[PDB]
Amino acid sequence: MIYDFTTKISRKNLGSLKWDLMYSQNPEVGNEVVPLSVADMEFKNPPELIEGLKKYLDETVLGYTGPTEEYKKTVKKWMKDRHQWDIQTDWIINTAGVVPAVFNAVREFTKPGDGVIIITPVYYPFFMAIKNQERKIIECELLEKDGYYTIDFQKLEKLSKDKNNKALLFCSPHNPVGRVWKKDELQKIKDIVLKSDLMLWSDEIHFDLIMPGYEHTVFQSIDEQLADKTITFTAPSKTFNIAGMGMSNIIIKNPDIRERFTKSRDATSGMPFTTLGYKACEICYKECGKWLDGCIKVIDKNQRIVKDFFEVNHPEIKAPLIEGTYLQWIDFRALKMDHKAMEEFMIHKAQIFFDEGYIFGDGGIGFERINLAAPSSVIQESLERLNKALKDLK
């Protein structure tokens, strides 16, 4: 199959939440502008998936649908071959998206007033899943040194000792800083977790999007006792740009926890009957491996394009390479602009639409998250607009 990561596509007036958001923020945005905000790709989906879905549409009946044993086997096989992770078919529980699964986790395993620990700054829906259900957000801020983010273990161990805290909501790879947790880091966290009564909710939706050289370790794969009280969220959506196919594979080893998560889901959302969602995931894992390799190559090229751009044109702004995800963390703090001013400038002066750093927590103030999943030429067009805007800003 021949893949395309070069065609500049347009998603204007097509129901794209990302594009509609851009036009809503700046009605005067040029027609040549492409948003680099929300985490979905500016690439057509894998050809095999599209051809596969069309083939399926000619065979199937779009009725009440559930996962086939083959589907489960395919997900189990992906975890094995791609992550040296041994799971069983009956460990897989499906939800229409990871966020709803997270909301469900909080709903079922905690009560109002209970605390949930998250490492910040981080993917904003985490905050929502907690406080929106009246639970307490317990922040364990990341330590940062010259752009490199690490875990505050002393503080984390302290928080785990607080009986009111019922679980650790973990992001791995960690959005938006692009960290792919090292084995030693995961070991320290594992010890803290097993030492307390904390449950482990590990969101590893970005675990297939790792940059060259780095290695992802499925958290619950390093210890069976840890796995006994862990809920791991996975899905093919971020990997193959199918967030609009709504299908997630939540892995839960413990029968008691699994059955509680399922009961709760069945009272809110219910079981996913989306036939194409099941098939899309199967097709991706079975046939879209080569496409993913090519996608990662382009992303790696793009993070280097960004890094180079600032080293050459505006050295005080830092865009370090990331370890995972296709979301790069750019440090604009040297501009000495508060986050509201930055946002205003990016949207109206540079017409570059990032996911403003501050939305991920106060630790993101001064930073900008750029979506690298676009053609290199598109990234270049955007940086040049920024270039002229920054120069004008003088």
Next chain:
Amino acid sequence: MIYDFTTKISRKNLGSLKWDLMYSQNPEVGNEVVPLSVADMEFKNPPELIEGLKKYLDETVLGYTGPTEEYKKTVKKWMKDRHQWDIQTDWIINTAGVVPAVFNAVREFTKPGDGVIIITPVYYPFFMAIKNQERKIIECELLEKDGYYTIDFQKLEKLSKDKNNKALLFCSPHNPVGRVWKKDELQKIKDIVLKSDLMLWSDEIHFDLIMPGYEHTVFQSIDEQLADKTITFTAPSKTFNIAGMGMSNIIIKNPDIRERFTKSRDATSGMPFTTLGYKACEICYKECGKWLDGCIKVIDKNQRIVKDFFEVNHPEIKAPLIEGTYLQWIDFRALKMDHKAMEEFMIHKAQIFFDEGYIFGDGGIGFERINLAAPSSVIQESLERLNKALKDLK
């Protein structure tokens, strides 16, 4: 076009909930057997839909997607053209299925211990939506005389006086009895509702599947004040056999009720991001009207086959014609077999898989619901199989 309502299809090992349930119940079931239980059709989807979805796939990106204004106008046009019902586009709230919407209504407009009135026997998920959320199921049993079901207005009024009951969860057309409510019946229910603090939740998922000779009336369309406190559940799933596309259109006129409903949805399932869900509904409404006409004819043709079948071979068993839906209600109380025992007989001796009447409430004990949405030849095969089983039964 050439619409196929004759090809006997097989959905074995394809993830069909209906078929898998069948095999689970009778591993020895013959390969010639087709289930007539779960409410999805044993027909392939509308040609226009399939060609439209394939075309859409060649042009779209499967990312985070929301409804377009065109989508909304199309939903509005369908209500206007097909039901003489004037709705506004901002009245439309989307969910991934009607059942989740019902759970949402119960969770947001009532509290634990509150009562929700339902007219039984009825679609079983209704019971679950209430009971599994710690709410009280308040049954208002339908009156039955020679097969025809009517509303017990006296009981409904009595129950409406209990301030603990917060709403009436209505099914129109009514599954599983097949009643399409007359304006006279709806007006009488309305007066009872308007004189109380009862909210109205009208599940009208079957309102496009009306048999010749009858006409559905959207409940909230008969009175503006009733509409002010009514939540109407609609979707294209039952109509075009796309329960596997996960897209429902919940119509809520009142701004405050709507806002609350949406808030409740966002705290549990969030909005549907399904790209194909929105497109499938728009295609069906715009291009699949003729297919639907052909489908209803076969359903009408089949219900008459069932009716005549019993009158000729087992007249003590009654299967009267229905007014709406494609689910026919059969009275098997003349066999004097307790339900659990009768189910056993149907599953193993006759190898006919109905939706056992008792599952819809005690009022269904002794009845069987047959899915008419299948090729006429398939209905005949099934009936002939039960015929032998019945005779041998003696």
